[PDB]
C-alpha cells in the first residue's frame, strides 16, 4: 500500500463556517472530550502592592464537560476500472503505467473524502447558529445530544401580529427591526448572512437599495475569504458598518441535495466570536504505534484479503465543533 | 505522407464555451459511454460508532449510463495547387520550394479542420444546455438522441402573460424578474450571458444603467478569457454582484454563418458548473495499433492509390458534451 | 494454499433451462449487464458483384441494456474432521495422506457449492419464463427489480372468465384454448412443460388422453435433456405439433425442498428461443492481478487470522439470466 506520508492535499476549504467562526482549534489526547480542559478567560490584573506576591491566576472555563464526538470515517476502493479525468498537457505515455494511475486515482479519492468529511462539521456549525442545540444521529451510531447552553430570545423569530411579508414593502424600514433583534447579542453584531429565498423578501423593501452600500470590496478582507468559495457563498453589500452575504450551499444525502439553512431564517453575530475546533483521538492500532492519536484527520491505505478481496483507502476523524459563547448569535426564524 | 508527430498546434481557443462550464475532460476505453465510470458526486460522511464495524461507500451512475459518442471525421486533400494565405513576414523565397510548400498547406488545412469540429462541440454544448434537450443527426449517419434531464422549472418563457418588451421602459425595473427566474437555479448564479439582440431590450430599463457596474471590470480572471476571444464575446461588467456577457458566436452552416443562440433567449447559471467532455473510441485500425483509441483528436496523414491517386489527411474524434446537473441553468425565452 | 488450478469441476447438471432457452452464455468485462453489446443474429447474405468494394458485416441492434448482475458469494470452511464420502472406484490406499484429503475435501466442498450456485441460477431461469418480471432480494445485498418486458397477454389466467375445474372432464376439448393461447407467442410453441398436480386434472379431459400420441420417440432430440435428469423430467408423448413435457424439479431452501412450478401453470414456447446465460463482473482484486474479469465462475482459497483462525473456500458469480425476447413465451395461469 502507500506511506502515510503521502497526504499531498494542502487545500484550506472550509464552507464559510469554520474559517470564520472556528479558526482556533483544539485536538484532544484523549477518547471522550472534556469540555472543562479549554483555556478560558481571563481577569483584570488584580491590583496589589509591590511589597508582598500574589496569588496565582488559574483558569478553569465551563462546568460540563464529558461530551463526545461523532466517529465518521470514510472508506472507498481503487478498483482500477477509474476512467481518469483527462488531465490537460499531459502525455498519454504515462497514462500506460498502472502504477502512476493507481496514484493518480488515489488522489483524486483524497480530495473526493476530503469533500466528502467537510460538510458534516459544516452542518456542525450550522445547528451550533441555528438553535444552539445538536443532535448528532445515524445507524450504528448511538445518538447524542448536545447542549450548548443557549437562551430562548437567540431564537426569535417575526411570527406576530407584524411580519416583514405582511406590511408595506415600500415605506417600512427594516433597521428598526434589525437593531431590535441584535440588541440581545452579547456584543456588537457583524454578520447578517442571508438566505437567498429570505433575501428576496428582504430586498423587496426599496428603504434598504437607497442605503443599501453594494459597492465591490466589502472591507477589502471579507472577499479575500470568501472568493475561493465562489459556488456557495455570495456577497451583497454594505448596510453601512456591517456586511450582507447570501449562503445556499447544498450538502447532499445519498440521493438529492438540501440546503444547510432553514429557507426563512437569519443569523446575527461577529466576525470575531472564538469558536472551538476540537477532535477526538484516532482509535487506530498503528496510529497509536506512531503517535498521531491527536490529530484532525487520518489517511490509511491497506490491501484486505478473502472476503471483500480489494485493496482500500481510509479516512476517520471526530468533529464535536463547538463555540464558546452560544449566545453571542441570534437567530431569526423569517415570516 | 507526414509522420503522427506533425501534431504540433497546442493553441487553446475555443469560444467561451468549452472554457467557462466544461473545463475537464473525460476520454473512454470504450466505444459507447457509461456513466458508470464517471466518478459522479460526493456524499455524506454518515455517523457511525468507533472501529466496532464499517461499510463501504459506493458511488452510483444512477440508472440510465449508456451512450453513443458522436464520432466524425474531416477529410482534406493535399493539392499542391491551392493558394497560400498571405500570412505576414512571410518570405516568398523560402516558399518557391515544393518542400515549405506541402508542410504549410496541410498545416493550413489542419487548422481549419479543428476550428470547424470546435464549432461542432460548442454547437452540441448549447444544443444540450439552451433547453435540456439534445439531438444527434448526419447525414449518412443514423439519428440519435440524448435526454440531458432538464427540470420544467427550469425553461421559462417570458412571452406567456407578461412579456419584457410592452412594459415601461422607465420604471419597470427587472431586478424583480431575474431574481424570480434564479431562484430556481439550485445553485447561486453568477454567469448572466445575454445575446446580442436580447441585450438590448434588457438594458432598455433606464433602472438598469445606473446599478450597473463598468469600472474596468472587477468579476474575476475571467476578463482573461474575454479578450482572448474579444470577437463573438463581449463583457460589459457587473449587474451589482453577477457578470454581464454578451455572446455573439458564429457557426459554418452549408453556405450561411448562423448565430449560436436563438435571437431573444438567455441562459442563466453558475460559473462553476460541472460538465462533462466524453469521448468515444478511435474506431480505426492504427490508433489501436498504437492504443491512443481514447483521445480527443486523431491526426493521421496517407497516400492513397489505384482509384483515388492522391494523399488526404483525417481528424477523427468522438464527442458527447454532458452536463452533470441540467437544471443548475434556466432558459429565459424573452419576447 | 490451492491457486486456481483447483478447476475439476467436469459436472454438467444444467437442469432442463440451460439445454433447452439458454443455450448461449456470455460473461462482460464491464460491472452493469448492457443488451447492447450482444452479437444478435445473422440473416442470409447477399449476393456481392464479383469484381467489386463489398459490405462490411455489422450485427448490432436493439439496446434493452442497463441490468445489474446478481452477485452470489457462497461460503465455505474445510476444517478436517468429517469422514469423506466414499468415492466409488478410487483408491483408497492413498486416504493416509491427510494432504491428499485436504485435497478431496476442498473438491467436494466446491461440488456443493457450485450445486448451490447452479440452483441460483435455475430459480432465476424459472422465475424469468413465467412472468417476465425478475426481483432478487436478500440480506447485504439490496433487492433489485429486472423487467423482461412481457406484454400483460404473456400472462393469461384461466381464472378470467371460465376456469378449467368447472368444466365437463368426459365432454369438453382444450384444444380452442390451446391455440387462443398460442396466437400471441410471437412464434410456433411446441413445448408444454406442466405442473404434474395440475397436469393430472389436463389429462382429467378423455380427449386428451386418446388424442395424445405415445409413439416411442420425441421429434428430434428431446430426450437427450430428458435422459440426463430422468428423477424429475418426463416426456409424456405427443399432441400433433406440439411435445408434451412435465417437470418436476425441486431445489433446497435452508433446509427444505421447494417445487419450482407453481401448482396452476403452462407455458408455451419454442425450441430455439434465444435466452442469454449473462454473467456479471468478479469484484475479486486478485482477478484483476491476474485479469480474469470476465468469467461465469472463479475459485478462490485462503486462510483467515484472528477471530476465525480457519481456511474457507469461495465461489463468486454474478449470473444475470436474459431472455432476448421476452414475449417469445405465453405462461397461462390455470384455474
Request: charged share 25%.
Amino acid at each position: 500500500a502507500q506511506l502515510l506520508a503521502a497526504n499531498e492535499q494542502k487545500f484550506k476549504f472550509d464552507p464559510l463556517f469554520l474559517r470564520l467562526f472556528f479558526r482556533e482549534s483544539y485536538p484532544f489526547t484523549t477518547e471522550k472530550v472534556y469540555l472543562s480542559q479549554i483555556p478560558g478567560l481571563v481577569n483584570m490584573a488584580l491590583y496589589v502592592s509591590p511589597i508582598v506576591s500574589g496569588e496565582v491566576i488559574r483558569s478553569r472555563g465551563g462546568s460540563t464537560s464529558e461530551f463526545t464526538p461523532g466517529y465518521v470515517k470514510p472508506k472507498h476502493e481503487v478498483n482500477p476500472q477509474m476512467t481518469l479525468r483527462r488531465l490537460p498537457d499531459e502525455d498519454p505515455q504515462n497514462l500506460a503505467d498502472p502504477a502512476y494511475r493507481r496514484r493518480r486515482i488515489i488522489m483524486q479519492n483524497m480530495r473526493d473524502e476530503e469533500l466528502a468529511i467537510a460538510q458534516v462539521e459544516e452542518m456542525q456549525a450550522v445547528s451550533a447558529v441555528l438553535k444552539g442545540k445538536y443532535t448528532m444521529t445515524g445507524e450504528a451510531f448511538d445518538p447524542v445530544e448536545v447542549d450548548m447552553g443557549r437562551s430562548e430570545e437567540n431564537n426569535i423569530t417575526q411570527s406576530g401580529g407584524t411580519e416583514w411579508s405582511k406590511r408595506d414593502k415600500s415605506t417600512y424600514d427594516p433597521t428598526d427591526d434589525i437593531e431590535a433583534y441584535a440588541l440581545n447579542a452579547s456584543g456588537v453584531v457583524n454578520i447578517i448572512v442571508f438566505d437567498p429565498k429570505g433575501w428576496a423578501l428582504f430586498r423587496s423593501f426599496k428603504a434598504v437599495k437607497e442605503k443599501l452600500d453594494t459597492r465591490r470590496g466589502s472591507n477589502s478582507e471579507l472577499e479575500t475569504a470568501v472568493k475561493d468559495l465562489g459556488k456557495a457563498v455570495s456577497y451583497k453589500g454594505m448596510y453601512g458598518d456591517v456586511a450582507i452575504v447570501v449562503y445556499s450551499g447544498q450538502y447532499v444525502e445519498n440521493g438529492v441535495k438540501k440546503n444547510f439553512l432553514p429557507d426563512n431564517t437569519m443569523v446575527l453575530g461577529n466576525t470575531q466570536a472564538r469558536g472551538l475546533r476540537t477532535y477526538g483521538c484516532i482509535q487506530d492500532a498503528d496510529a497509536q504505534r506512531e503517535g498521531i492519536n491527536a490529530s484532525a484527520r487520518y489517511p490509511k491505505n491497506w490491501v484486505t484479503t478473502g472476503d471483500p478481496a480489494r485493496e482500500f483507502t481510509m479516512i476517520q476523524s471526530a468533529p464535536l465543533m463547538l463555540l464558546a459563547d452560544p449566545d453571542e448569535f441570534v437567530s431569526v426564524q423569517l415570516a
